[PDB]
């Protein structure tokens, strides 16, 4: 492809957006300005991402291009790439591309980014054997046999309908693999990828991770959202620093005890009741333990570097083990059984405090946590010890705001009444319990919430 005499730019590049861009690249003032093949031959790279381009008609004339970025456009047909064989890097994510046949003879490509398109057939990739980076996630690929001869691949991502990973067997140069959101259950082929440093495989149907045993260069592993229980194999992976095992069925954490390089550990939504194995993981900065079976969290006090900790949806009554963790900035324990928050006064760096659906009655210990920017104290509940029935039974209100003032009840059951500090009833007949509610907006530092709850008072 060569233009023969001087040609308007906007007769070479028919797409309106692309001709404007090329006018700039070629240093012309109007898109009707003339250029010759001389001029087009000088263009060796092109950053034309995010420009609303629908057609790349005309790029075939840019014979000397080595690097292009057409990502974030509206491309469908990419036929004009077919003979640009000096291309070494293509960035073309976030388009509407379905047919990549035009890439089949671009054998000098080392980088091809094609994620978030509508690709199903990657057969045209099979002879692109110099590829070291290939991104193909957010597509609808089911069959990766075309990848089997890409033995220089270092970084690789694909999706979203793949079951069979057998084609990866000879890709032993692989260092970083992302197979998230496919249909994968069998990762036995991954055993052959001994140079793997990072494996991201979230949201599959993996239950057997024994293939990971000899992948000892792994430093990042994500298996969020699979069907793991037995994680014994992980004790081999002593170079791990970032491990995500959330949304699984794990209970025994002993295999993690020696992974002392770990700085991030996600274990939310599992079956954990014993966190003694984590007590030696003192480099941890982020730990997620939400949606487990925890009561005794005393071994968390060892984790002095934590800045982010989740504990929401467990059965925790004693929060005081976190009170040692002075670097903490965000702490989440919604839906537990905590009443005494006094130990939290020691968390002087805290910015997010999420403590709804506990048994918190008294905010005074929190009063000096003025770095707070987000706060949650909604929907506390507790049941007082029984008191003796009397027709005129009365109890003190115990709900205290951060200022120390009692919060007047919002509602009181059975027509009862408040005169600070006492709630008083007038019961004609015996009743099994009475109750009251409170609801009070409050701000500590900059964080704002409604401190609310329901207090139940059983009567003897």
């Amino acid at each position: 492809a060569t233009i023969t005499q001087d040609t308007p730019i906007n007769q070479i590049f028919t797409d309106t957006a692309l001709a404007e861009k090329m006018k700039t690249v070629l240093g012309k003032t109007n898109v009707t300005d003339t250029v010759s093949q001389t001029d087009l031959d000088q263009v060796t790279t092109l950053q034309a991402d995010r420009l609303g381009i629908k057609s790349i008609d005309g790029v075939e004339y840019l014979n000397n291009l080595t690097q292009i970025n057409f990502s974030n456009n509206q491309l469908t047909d990419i036929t004009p790439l077919k003979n640009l064989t000096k291309l070494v890097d293509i960035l073309m994510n976030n388009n509407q591309i379905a047919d990549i046949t035009p890439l089949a003879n671009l054998t000098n490509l080392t980088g091809l980014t094609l994620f978030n398109n509508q690709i199903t057939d990657i057969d045209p990739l099979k002879n692109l054997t110099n590829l070291n980076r290939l991104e193909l996630s957010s597509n609808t690929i089911s069959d990766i046999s075309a990848l089997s001869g890409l033995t220089s691949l270092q970084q690789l991502s694909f999706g979203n309908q793949v079951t069979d990973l057998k084609p990866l067997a000879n890709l032993t140069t692989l260092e970083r693999l992302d197979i998230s959101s496919n249909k994968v259950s069998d990762i036995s082929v991954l055993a052959k990828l001994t140079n793997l440093e990072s494996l991201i495989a979230t949201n599959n149907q993996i239950s057997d991770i024994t293939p990971l045993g000899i992948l000892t260069n792994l430093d990042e592993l994500s298996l969020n959202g699979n069907q793991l229980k037995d994680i014994g194999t992980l004790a081999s992976l002593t170079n791990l620093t970032d491990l995500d095992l959330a949304n699984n069925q794990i209970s025994n954490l002993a295999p993690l005890s020696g992974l002392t390089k770990l700085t991030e550990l996600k274990l939310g939504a599992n079956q954990i009741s014993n966190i003694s194995p984590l007590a030696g993981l003192t480099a941890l900065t982020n730990l997620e333990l939400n949606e487990n079976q925890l009561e005794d969290i005393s071994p968390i006090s060892n984790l002095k570097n934590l800045t982010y900790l989740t504990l929401y949806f467990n059965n925790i009554s004693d929060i005081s083990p976190v009170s040692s963790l002075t670097k903490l900035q965000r702490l989440f324990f919604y839906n537990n059984k905590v009443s005494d928050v006094s130990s939290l006064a020691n968390l002087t760096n805290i910015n997010w405090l999420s403590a709804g659906h506990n048994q918190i009655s008294d905010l005074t210990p929190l009063a000096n946590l003025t770095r707070i920017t987000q706060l949650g104290l909604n929907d506390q509940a507790w049941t007082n010890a029984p008191v003796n029935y009397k027709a005129n039974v009365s109890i003190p209100n115990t709900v205290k705001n951060v200022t120390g003032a009692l919060i007047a009840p919002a509602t009181i059951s059975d027509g009862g009444s408040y005169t600070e500090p006492d709630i008083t009833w007038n019961l004609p007949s015996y009743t099994n319990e009475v109750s009251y509610t409170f609801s009070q907006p409050v701000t500590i530092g900059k964080g704002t919430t409604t401190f609310s709850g329901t207090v139940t008072q059983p009567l003897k």
Binding site: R50, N93, S137, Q374, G376, G447
Partner: protein, 104 residues
Amino acid sequence: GPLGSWVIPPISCPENEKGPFPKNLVQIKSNKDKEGKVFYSITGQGADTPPVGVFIIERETGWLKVTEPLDRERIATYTLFSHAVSSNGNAVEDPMEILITVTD
């Protein structure tokens, strides 16, 4: 208050990262997912205004991802908003402002 049932860690991305892209940064979550499916989106410069799509979020999982290598000396910080909606289109949280800091 604004916290609502958001659960979000601080977000930091080194510049000049290696692929494959898109790369997970953090998983944004609302605990409102305990009473029905929640669908996530983001807005702001770098998400839905220029430069569009540097940051994206997977609408069903809440995974916030970066789609390309960053350059701290070009733009060191981005301000995004996370949104959470029900199947029926209704907001189940107030938009949360998220700082993304680009590091060394």
